[PDB]
Structure formats: C-alpha cells, structure tokens
Design a protein around this ligand. Structure first.
Ligand SMILES: [Zn+2]
Ligand SMILES: [Zn+2]
Lengths: 803, 424
C-alpha cells in the first residue's frame, strides 16, 4: 500500500534535513509540509515511530550548539513537535524522553532567535498547556517570566498576540481548577511589577505594554461564561484602581492615556460580570463609569473620547445575554445602551454644527447623568468628524436594530448640514449607504428622505466635485430609489443625461447602473410614473453610447441596461423598436473580442427574442452566430449564456395520439434543422471547463427522459539590438460583419445519430475527470516528489522574480 | 516620532508585497500584492494583523500601488471588497488601465473574486502623474517618480511633517531598450525602502532570436507562454522586426484573445516613455494546433497554469523538435516549475503522462536593478537609513555589508511580520 511509499519518501527527506550543511531558499515548501501535516488524513505519519526519533536527533543536535547547525529547520522542528503534542500516545513518549524540557531550555538560554523559532516554541507551549501534566511541568519550570519577556519586549507582534493567549490560559486554568494561589499570585505580581516598581521615554514602553496585557487578560475574562476568582485577586492584593489613578497623575501623553483608559474601562466591565454573577442596582459601575467619562471631558482630548466610547459599546455588546438593558443607577430606569451611542455621536454633531437645534431632539433619549455631561462637554468645546464617523461605522458589526436607525438619522442630519473639505462628505455618504443596505432603513424609519434626495440632487448638480464622491452619490441615489419608495423626477431628469456624458469612466458606468436599476423598478413593482422619466431621452443615448464609448466596462453596463429596459412595452413601442437593434447585436456577438461584453450581448438578444419578435430575415444569421458563440475558444460565461439561450428557445418552441406525435416530430425536426443535437455533441466531447460540463450533463439528462420514447544574419541582429523600441515603432506608426447565413449547415446532425453517439460515450466520467485530477493534483505524494526535486537540484541561476 | 515598518509579506522573500509604513501618526499601506504559490488564505496578505475579526479597515490613510505585477496588485480586489476599505488608492495612469486586464485574467485562471469586485475596487482608484505633489487630507504629501521595469511603474516619495520616505518597489538604474533608468532629485529622506532581487548580480536577447530562428527552420514549432501584458510586448517587436528585416515565411500565431491589448500597450508606451496592426502576426484558433508546418505561438497564461497554453503544451510535448521558451519565473505548483526543474514526465487529466522531450529553455526578461544600481541610487538620494525587502535572504545579507562599508549607513532586513522601529 502507498503508506509505506510516502513514509519512505518522508524518511529520506527528513534524513536530508539533519545534515550540517544546508542552503535552501523558497520557504514555501516548509509551510506546505506543515499544512499537509495538519490534515487529519495524514494522521498516520505522526503515529509512525520515525518522526519522534527525528525530533530527538535534531534536538540533541541543536542543544549543545547551533551557531550554524540549522538555519531554519529548527522552526519546522518546533512546529512538528507542537503538531505531535496532541494526546493519543505522543504525550507520554514526549514526556518520558527529554524533548520538551530541552525545547523549553533552548528557548530560555538563547538570545537572538529569529521570529519564527519563537512562534514555533510558543505554539509548542500552547499545544502542551491544554493538558494537566503540561501545566504541572510549566508550574515546575517557572516558564512564565519568559512569556512576560516576550509579551513586553519583542517586536514581532505575531508573537505577542500568541504569547498572551498562553499566558491568560495558564492564569485562568490555575485559578479555576482549585490549584494553589501561590503560583497565581506570583504570575500576577510578575505581570504587575513594572507598575508597582514605578509607584523619560523608556519606562513608558514597559508601562504601556503591561497595561495592554492586563486589559487583554480582563477582556478575555469578560468573554467567559463562568464565575472566576481572578478579578478579586487582582483587586485585593495589588489594588488596581488606586495604583492606576496614581499612574495617570505624573506621566502625560495623548496616545499613552488611551491605554490607561481602556484598561480601566475593561476592568470595570470585568468587575461587573465577575461580581454581579454571585456575591439589584448597578450603581457601583455607574458612578465609576460616569466620573471616568467626566475625567475624559476635563482632560480635553477628542480622539481618546470617541475611541473609549466605541470600546465601551463593544464590551457591553460582548457581555451578551446577561445584561438587563435597563440599569437602575440611582432610583432611575436608565437604559444603558442609548447613552453609549449618545456619547459616541455627540462629538460628530458638535463638530459639524460649528446654539443647538437638532441635538435637543436627540437628548431626550438620554437621561440626566448624560445631560449634565453633555452640558459640560459644550462648555469644554482638527479632523475629528471623519474619525468619529469611521468609529461609528466600525461599530456596525454589532449593533442590533434601533441604534442603527438612530445613527442613520444622525448621519442624515450631518449630511444635510454638510451639503448646505470633501473627506467628511465622502465618509458620511459611504457610511449611510452601508448602514441602509445592511439594516433595512426603508422610508417608514427615516423621517426626511425628501431632504436626502434634494441634497443629493444639489451635490450631483451644482458643484462638480472629484469623481470619487460622485460615484458614491449615484450609489446613494440608487439605494434611495429602490428602498425609499412610496420633486424626484425633475431632479433626476437632466442630471442623468449630463452624467452619462461625463469625461471619466467611473461616472458613466455608475450612471448606467443607476439607469438600469430605475428601469427595473419601472416594471410591475412601480407604476409608469418612472417610465415617462426614462421615456424623455434615455433609450437613444443608452443605445448610441453602448455603440462606442471606448471603455469595455461601460459597454458591458450599457448592454445589460439595454437588456433590462427592452422588455417593458412603452419604451419598445415608443423609441427603441425604430432603431435596428438586432443588427448591432449580431455584429457584436461575432466580430468583437473582449468577451465580457459578448455574454451580456447574448443576454440582451435572449430578452429581445423571448419577449418580442424579430424579422423573419434574421433567423438564419441569428442561429449561425449563436452556434458560433459556443463553438470555439470562448470564455465560460459566453458558452453558458448561449446554452441558456438554446435551452430557453427549445423549451419555448416545444409548447406549441397520432396528431400530437406528428406535431412533436415536426418540432424536433425544426429544432434539428438549424442544428442543436450536433452542437451538443461537439461541445460535450471536446470542451474542457468546469461548470459547462455540469450544465450540459444536466441539460441532456433532463432532456433524455422526454426524448428516448419518441555572416548575413548577424548584421540584422546587431542592428536590431542597437536601437530602442521607441525607434522601432516610429517606423511602425509611419508605415465581414454578419457571418454568412449558412454556418450552421455543417452542424446538422439528425436525431438518429444522437441516439447512438450519446449511447456510446460515458457521461459522469467527463465531469469526474477534471475534478478528480484537481483533487489529486496537490496530494501529499506530489508535494514530496516536488520537494525532493527541489532539494537534489541546485540551480543558482534560477532567481525568484517579480511574477 | 518613530518610523515603523512591518512587512506582511515580501521581506526575505518575493511576492505578497505589502508594507505598513506606520509613521508620523498616520498609517500608510504600501503595495498590496498576491502570492501565486499558496492556494489557501495565505495567498493574499494576512489582514488580521491590523483589525482582528473586523471586516472594515479605518486605519490606513492611503494605499499606494507601485506597478501592475501580480505580486503588487493581485490582492487589491480582496483588500477592497471582502475586507472592507473605502479610502483612496493612489496609482499611476498606465498601471490604472493595465491592472484590470491582468486581474480579470487571473480571475479566469483561478477558476475567488468576481468582475463586479474588480470594477468596484477600481472605481475608488485615484490616478497620479509624475512629479506632481498631491496631498491626502493634511500633511500626507505624495510625489511619484519614474521608475522603469514595466510600463507605468513609479516609486513614491511620502512626506508626513519633516519625515520623508522614498519607497522604490521595482526599479532599474541601468540604461536599456524598452524603458530607461529611474530618476530622483536630491531629496534626503529619513528612510529608503529598496529592492534586492539582483543583489549578487544583449546576451539575454541575442540568444532568444538566434535560438528561435534556428529552431523554426528544422520543422519544429515553438510555444511561448506569456501573460496578457508585460513580457508579451517585449518580444513581439523583436520577432516582428527580425522577420521584417529578414524576409521569412513561417507564421507566428498570437492567441486570438490578446491582439487588441497589443494596441493599448503601444498606445500608452509612447506617452509614458517620453490603431496598430502587425505585419506577420495573425491570431489563431484551436484547429491550427495540429497543422503540420512550423509556427511560433504566443499563448496565455505565462506559467502553464491552465487554459490555452496547457492544451497546446499537452499536444506538442512528445515531439523532439519542438521547444517552450518560458520567459519568466514559474512559481511552485505550476507545470512550469516541474518542466524548468528537469522533469521529463508530467502527469495530466486521467493518469496520462506526456513524456516531455521538447527542448525547454528559460530566459529572464525582467530587468531589475543589479548590485551597482542600488549604490548608484543611494549616491543620488543619500538617505539616513536603508531597508531591503524584495528578494532572498543571503543576497541581502551580502549587500548589507557592502552598504555599511561604502556609505556608513545602517540596513534592516525584516522577516515576514516583524516591526522595524527606526528612530531619529
Ligand atoms: Zn515588478
Ligand atoms: Zn515584485
């Protein structure tokens, strides 16, 4: 069986690794192996008695000295040990041998490990620390000071986000398993030490790092669903708030104070969850939170305020179901969720306003403790608006139903005031668009949608800003049309026509998107009041700019618009049928490369043929071009659309004793004379793609139950080589349509041959081949063969280059 | 003030080029590129480094893309549509109109990110012209300088309040045929990121023409897999001029869905460096492959990924006289790497092995900067620190000693995911 073969290949390559001389770039291979050792299917290659022997040999080869014994194999070794450390049998074999102890000592006694050995060792620590015996060893070895060293000093930032998880896991598991508080107190004191010791610019780094680590520990306890005693230990022995409030006293920085305020707020929320869970009102959190926010008011800092409000919101949403949503602060019924968003929105409203006109309507949502803080904010009084908007729209992942409505209304107000720097404008328009399309803020929820459309019309019309904002404006108008449905017409009349003539690509494509949206609205969903808006001048300009605008995406968008607005009767009867449209489609479907637009031309043709009539003189050319549109080197979309055309045509024509037998035989005769069975054979036996195969298989299968019943040359070389390509092109600069109407005659295969030639050929093998080969393309054995070839061959002149 | 750079890719490596110039209190993202090796989520740069679990990014002030190679552009739709991003994306006009074609071709080869994502990702793009100081919101001033190495490549000069950075990306300081040499004024930045692909490093051009001519005469066909743009237009002047100065009669087919791009490239070329049809070039179809006489077929893609080039290669393989002049690096996993690596057998759709007997060749055409070019660039710019990100580890280690020896500067070589704090 192949298992011994792949194990032998792995044995050979592992034997290659240990050799003292090594020079191999192209790191990919290593990571590939690691991923292919993670999959559970290869679970036998770790069970074999070879890998642990390799690990032992490499470690006893690295522990005495590795000045140069392994450049990068060590990282693979540690990751492989971590992959081994899962408990079936490896844990006791690793325990009985001196592997894990030597690895930890190796990590301890080194000085300048490159940041891939470190992550491997930390991965080993994480994989071993989930088990009880691993925790016993870690408690024995006094390992945590190394983890503090990593999470405090190193520059990797992929290590610290991995080291802190192991650190917090030891702290939580030691606390919650009823183990001695001596070790937990020692860990916490070791974390706490750079602050207690201090109670320039060098100690501040240690202070900030340990504050951030403490905040991470507290937030991870906040995620927890069970009662833990870590917070009481943190409050009692190393009294936290008093030390932190003494720490804020001397040192001064705006960036550094965000960390102290987030650790204080995270501590408050963690204390709530781990004191209220077991020993009413929430006043104890209340006074602390509000004097904290008052201190942020008094310090006169803007960005830290909105960031802290954001994080308070995130944490409260992180509490989850165990939150009453109504806090009894002091004899009151104060719902907490609204005051966070009031604090969040207020800097934006106060910044863009400049004496209150609209915030006064908002503040009745807030309660008196928020009113006093707002009234001292106003007395307390840069680019702060866009930061607040981006914070608000960072919150949108977790924001349930009504705060979305409130923030949408506030953004509507700030947009209305901004209309009557463009960065705030672009930010608010993007945010309003994404909130509307996510939270379904249809006209019943918003109040002043007329102001929205009017200010958007002014923006689109009278000032002509840069094109990065006009696109967003047209997207907003599109959302307003298709969601705020229940003035607009005279505003959207000339601006569409003017923007369809814009100098830039980015505006014309978006305007075509808006036009096809409002044309799709003009169907049965909405009355014809939109149609006469379109019926002024739009279908001529759409057609004659779909003809030639010299940008491929523009022509694609125009063709799909013209497909959408051709199946409505008023436009076709008034101003579209006069233009010979099918002629231009036939010209496009054949004599036009860049086949992103050919597929949508096929769609437009499908709509025209299905919902209208074409002249009887075009049918031969039509079917010839349609047969050509699938046979030949075309992209997948064109072939799939053309097969959709043929299936729709076949089924549509099919709905029109002996008499039924003769009529049905005539129907198959009419469809085969133009050629449909033979083209299916030639597309089935030859065309190689993924989804076309399933489409053809399901089509033929659905069909086949309703079917079976019925010297001299060197002077030119040196002359070429001694002139630039700018001088071989000055010389180069200075010096049919509508295919013949009987192209389909060759693809005219009768029904009788379609019996036999479909009976002989296999069906599921065609769809099976191209998927099974892709599954076997990157199997483990192929990777081992490739990496053996890479190791044995050493071509120095083959350089990894800019792809 | 402390400049921090933390390459999420392309540090002691190539591909996934992505650098985070967090400096002056304003986050900036350099090139956003893909890695055509890995097929898992490692293909695009890891973005959990900035905002974990957050599908919207509100930290980077601006994203700067140097040139259109798919190790500097391929992740841009993923960075702008899957992970949200709505801020500006500054890039040059030829790169702006060349990138969608390459991204669409990569989409077709890889089948995930739809054409709608391609369009929406580049409605955000802002184009920048050379030597024109354009400002993001306030005290984030960007200038672009002519670089080389591909059509429409520039290297950028970023200033945030008396702290300048010059990011080169890709450049070429030697004079050449296609594009000349990059130029820089006497700005004195507090950093200069650079390239070190050719730290250790005519004859690469004569051996192309003189070999393809001597191979086409013997009745053997020639296959040249290329991408849509880039290197496919480096050669289609040499072959056409070689077969117009010397009268030849063999056809050189050109892979039909490619020919209109050869007009756009040379339309932009004469604008950048300082209708169009070819004489002996005619596009071809799947029927011409089995025809008996000699040909020189260009095809897409350029690493024998999948598509036209693989089906052509699957039929011309057993013949001895045929040849496959791959013109660029072939990454791990493409049939190109096995063939350039001495494989004489390659597997296929149903346990079929094509016994390659064709004469595979390899000729690099990229024209990066060699060893002398980087010290020439340093002598023109005179920075305060030097940083090398693009290339292999040992070559940068060797170049660091020479830089320290000559100019007495420092030199940093970060790994993937390692902040490099630089002081003043
Ligand atoms: Zn490049
Ligand atoms: Zn590159």
């Amino acid at each position: 069986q192949k298992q011994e073969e792949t194990l032998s290949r792995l044995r050979t390559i592992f034997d290659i690794f240990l050799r003292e001389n090594f020079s191999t770039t192209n790191n990919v291979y290593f990571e590939k192996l690691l991923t292919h050792l993670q999959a559970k299917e290869n679970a036998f290659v770790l069970q074999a008695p070879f890998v642990v022997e390799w690990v032992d040999r490499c470690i006893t080869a690295v522990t005495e000295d590795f000045k140069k014994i392994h450049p990068k194999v060590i990282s693979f070794m540690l990751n492989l040990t971590s992959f081994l450390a899962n408990n079936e049998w490896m844990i006791v074999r690793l325990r009985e041998l001196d592997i894990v102890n030597r690895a930890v000592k190796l990590l301890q006694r080194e000085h300048n490990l490159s940041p891939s050995i470190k992550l491997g060792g930390i991965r080993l620590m994480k994989a071993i620390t989930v088990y009880s015996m691993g925790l016993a060893f870690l408690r024995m070895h006094r390992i945590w000071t190394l983890l503090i060293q990593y999470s405090n000093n190193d520059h990797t930032l992929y290590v610290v986000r991995e080291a802190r998880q192991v650190l917090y896991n030891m702290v939580y598991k030691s606390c919650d398993k009823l183990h001695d508080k001596a070790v937990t107190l020692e860990i916490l004191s070791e974390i706490m030490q750079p602050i207690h010791d201090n109670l320039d610019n060098e100690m501040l780094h240690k202070i900030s790092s340990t504050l951030d680590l403490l905040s991470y520990i507290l937030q991870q306890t906040l995620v927890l669903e069970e009662r833990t005693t870590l917070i009481i230990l943190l409050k009692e022995h190393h009294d936290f708030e008093i030390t932190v409030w003494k720490l804020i006293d001397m040192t001064h920085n705006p960036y550094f104070t965000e960390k102290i305020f987030t650790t204080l707020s995270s501590y408050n929320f963690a204390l709530l969850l781990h004191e209220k869970l077991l020993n009413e009102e929430f006043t104890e959190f209340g006074l602390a939170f509000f004097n904290l926010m008052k201190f942020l008011i008094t310090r006169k800092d803007g960005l830290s305020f909105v960031k802290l409000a954001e994080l308070n919101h995130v944490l409260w949403k992180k509490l989850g179901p165990r939150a009453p949503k109504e806090i009894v602060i002091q004899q009151e019924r104060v719902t907490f969720e609204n005051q966070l968003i009031c604090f969040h929105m207020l800097p934006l409203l106060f910044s863009m306003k400049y004496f209150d006109a609209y915030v006064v309507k908002l503040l009745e949502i807030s309660c008196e403790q928020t009113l006093r803080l707002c009234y001292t904010m106003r007395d307390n009084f840069a680019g702060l608006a866009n930061k607040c908007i981006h914070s608000l729209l960072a919150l949108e992942n977790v924001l349930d139903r009504e705060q979305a409505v409130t923030v949408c209304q506030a953004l509507l107000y700030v947009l209305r005031e901004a209309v009557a720097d463009p960065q705030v404008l672009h930010s608010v328009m993007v945010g309003l668009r994404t909130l509307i399309e996510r939270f379904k803020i249809t006209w019943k929820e918003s109040v002043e949608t007329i102001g929205l459309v009017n200010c958007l019309a002014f923006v689109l019309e009278n000032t002509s800003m840069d094109a990065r904002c006009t696109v967003q404006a047209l997207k907003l108008v599109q959302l307003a049309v298709e969601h705020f449905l229940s003035s607009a017409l005279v505003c959207l009349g000339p601006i569409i026509v003017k923007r369809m003539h814009d100098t830039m690509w980015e505006v014309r494509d978006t305007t075509l998107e808006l036009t096809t949206s409002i044309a799709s609205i003009s169907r049965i969903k909405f009355p014809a009041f939109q149609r006469f808006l379109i019926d002024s001048k739009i279908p001529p300009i759409v057609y004659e700019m779909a003809k030639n605008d010299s940008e491929v995406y523009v022509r694609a968008s125009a063709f799909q618009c013209l497909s959408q607005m051709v199946s409505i009767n008023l436009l076709w009867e008034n101003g579209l049928s006069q233009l010979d449209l099918v002629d231009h489609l036939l010209f496009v479907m054949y004599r036009e490369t860049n086949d992103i637009v050919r597929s949508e031309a096929v769609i437009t043709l499908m709509k025209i043929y299905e919902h209208r009539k074409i002249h009887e003189k075009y049918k031969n050319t039509l079917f010839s071009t349609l047969n050509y549109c699938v046979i030949g080197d075309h992209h997948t979309e064109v072939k799939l659309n053309a097969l959709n055309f043929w299936r729709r045509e076949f089924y549509r024509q099919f709905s029109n004793e002996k008499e039924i037998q003769t009529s049905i035989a005539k129907v198959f005769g009419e469809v085969q004379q133009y050629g449909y069975f033979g083209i299916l054979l030639k597309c089935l036996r030859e065309e190689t793609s993924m989804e076309v195969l399933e489409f053809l298989i399901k089509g033929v299968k659905t069909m086949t139950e309703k079917f079976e019943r019925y010297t001299e040359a060197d002077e030119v070389i040196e002359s070429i080589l001694n002139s630039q390509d700018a001088q071989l092109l000055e010389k180069a600069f200075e010096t049919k349509r509508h295919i013949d109407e009987f192209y389909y005659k060759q693809f005219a295969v009768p029904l009788r041959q379609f019996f036999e030639e479909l009976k002989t050929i296999d069906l599921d093998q065609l769809v099976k081949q191209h998927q099974e080969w892709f599954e076997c393309k990157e199997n483990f054995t192929s990777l081992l063969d490739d990496i053996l070839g890479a190791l044995k061959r050493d071509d120095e002149n083959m350089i990894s280059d800019c792809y | 003030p402390d400049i921090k750079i933390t390459p999420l890719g392309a540090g002691q490596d190539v591909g996934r080029s992505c650098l985070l110039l967090s400096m002056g209190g304003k986050n900036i993202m350099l090139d956003c590129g893909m890695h055509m090796g890995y097929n898992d989520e490692r293909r695009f740069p890891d973005f959990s480094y900035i905002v974990p679990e957050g599908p919207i990014t509100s930290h980077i002030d601006c994203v700067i893309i140097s040139h259109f190679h798919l190790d500097h552009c391929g992740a841009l739709p993923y960075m702008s549509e899957i992970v949200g991003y709505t801020g500006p994306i500054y890039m040059t006009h030829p790169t702006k109109a060349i990138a969608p074609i390459l991204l669409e071709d990569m989409r077709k080869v890889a089948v995930f990110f739809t054409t709608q994502m391609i369009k929406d990702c580049m409605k955000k793009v802002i184009p920048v012209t050379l030597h024109q100081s354009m400002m993001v919101d306030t005290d984030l001033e960007i200038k672009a300088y002519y670089a080389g190495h591909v059509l429409g490549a520039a290297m950028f000069w970023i200033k945030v309040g008396s702290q300048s950075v010059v990011y080169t990306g890709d450049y070429n300081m030697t004079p050449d045929r296609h594009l000349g040499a990059a130029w820089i004024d006497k700005c004195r930045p507090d950093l200069l990121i650079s390239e070190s692909t050719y730290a250790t490093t005519r004859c690469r051009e004569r051996d192309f023409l003189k070999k393809v001519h001597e191979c086409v005469a013997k009745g053997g066909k020639v296959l040249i897999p290329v991408f849509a743009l880039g290197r496919a237009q480096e050669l289609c002047i040499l072959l056409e001029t070689y077969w117009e100065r010397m009268n030849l009669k063999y056809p050189i087919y050109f892979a039909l869905g490619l020919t209109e791009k050869a007009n756009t490239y040379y339309k932009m070329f004469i604008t950048w460096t300082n209708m169009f049809d070819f004489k002996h070039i005619k596009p071809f179809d799947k029927a011409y492959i089995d025809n008996p006489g000699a040909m020189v077929v260009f095809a897409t893609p350029g690493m024998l990924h999948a598509g036209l080039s693989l089906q052509i290669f699957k039929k011309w393989a057993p013949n001895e006289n045929n040849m496959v002049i791959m013109p660029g690096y072939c990454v791990q996993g493409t049939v190109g790497n096995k063939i350039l690596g001495g494989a004489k057998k390659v597997e296929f759709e149903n346990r079929q092995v094509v016994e390659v007997k064709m004469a595979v060749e390899y000729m690099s055409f990229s024209a990066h900067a060699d060893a002398k070019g980087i010290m020439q660039l340093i002598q023109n710019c005179e920075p305060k620190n030097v940083m090398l990100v693009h290339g292999e580890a040992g070559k940068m280690k060797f170049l660091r000693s020479k830089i320290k020896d000559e100019f007495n500067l420092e030199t940093y070589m970060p790994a993937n995911g390692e902040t490099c704090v630089i002081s003043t």
